[PDB]
């Protein structure tokens, strides 16, 4: 029973600022594609950096995330 686009929800957020990433947290750069996985009550959410060349996870600050509703090749 393969549908296609319909199946499971997904929240892809794009970084809107370059982060350094402490020794405990993970670092990244503005312009990466992450996928919101979990969200803590403190504000820190567990995303998944889809850098491609070197992807990695790590709780990042929601403040450094923006809903990427729009997509490329829009015309």
UniProtKB/Swiss-Prot annotation:
Signal peptide: none annotated. It is found in: Cytoplasm; Cell projection, Podosome. Found in several cancer cell lines, particularly invasive breast carcinomas and melanomas. Tyrosine phosphorylated by SRC. Phosphorylation plays a regulatory role in the protein localization. The intramolecular interaction of the PX domain with the third SH3 domain maintains the protein in the cytoplasm and phosphorylation disrupts this interaction, resulting in the redistribution of the protein from cytoplasm to the perimembrane region. Phosphorylated on serine upon DNA damage, probably by ATM or ATR. Residues 8-69 form the SH3 domain. Belongs to the SH3PXD2 family. The PX domain is required for podosome localization because of its ability to bind phosphatidylinositol 3-phosphate (PtdIns(3)P) and phosphatidylinositol 3,4-bisphosphate (PtdIns(3,4)P2) and, to a lesser extent, phosphatidylinositol 4-phosphate (PtdIns(4)P), phosphatidylinositol 5-phosphate (PtdIns(5)P), and phosphatidylinositol 3,5-bisphosphate (PtdIns(3,5)P2). Binds to the third intramolecular SH3 domain. Required for interaction with RAB40B. Interacts (via N-terminus) with CYBA. Interacts with ADAM12, ADAM15 and ADAM19. Interacts with NOXO1. Interacts (via SH3 domains) with NOXA1. Interacts with FASLG. Interacts (via PX domain) with RAB40B (GTP-bound); interaction promotes invadopodia-mediated extracellular matrix degradation. Adapter protein involved in invadopodia and podosome formation, extracellular matrix degradation and invasiveness of some cancer cells. Binds matrix metalloproteinases (ADAMs), NADPH oxidases (NOXs) and phosphoinositides. Acts as an organizer protein that allows NOX1- or NOX3-dependent reactive oxygen species (ROS) generation and ROS localization. In association with ADAM12, mediates the neurotoxic effect of amyloid-beta peptide. This is SH3 and PX domain-containing protein 2A.
């Amino acid at each position: 029973g393969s549908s296609g686009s319909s199946g499971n929800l997904k929240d892809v957020y794009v970084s809107i600022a370059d982060y350094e990433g402490d020794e405990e947290t993970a670092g990244f750069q503005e312009g990466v594609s992450m996928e919101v996985l979990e969200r803590n009550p403190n504000g820190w959410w567990y995303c998944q950096i889809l850098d491609g060349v070197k992807p990695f996870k790590g709780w990042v600050p929601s403040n450094y995330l923006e809903k990427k509703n729009s997509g490329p090749s829009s015309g």
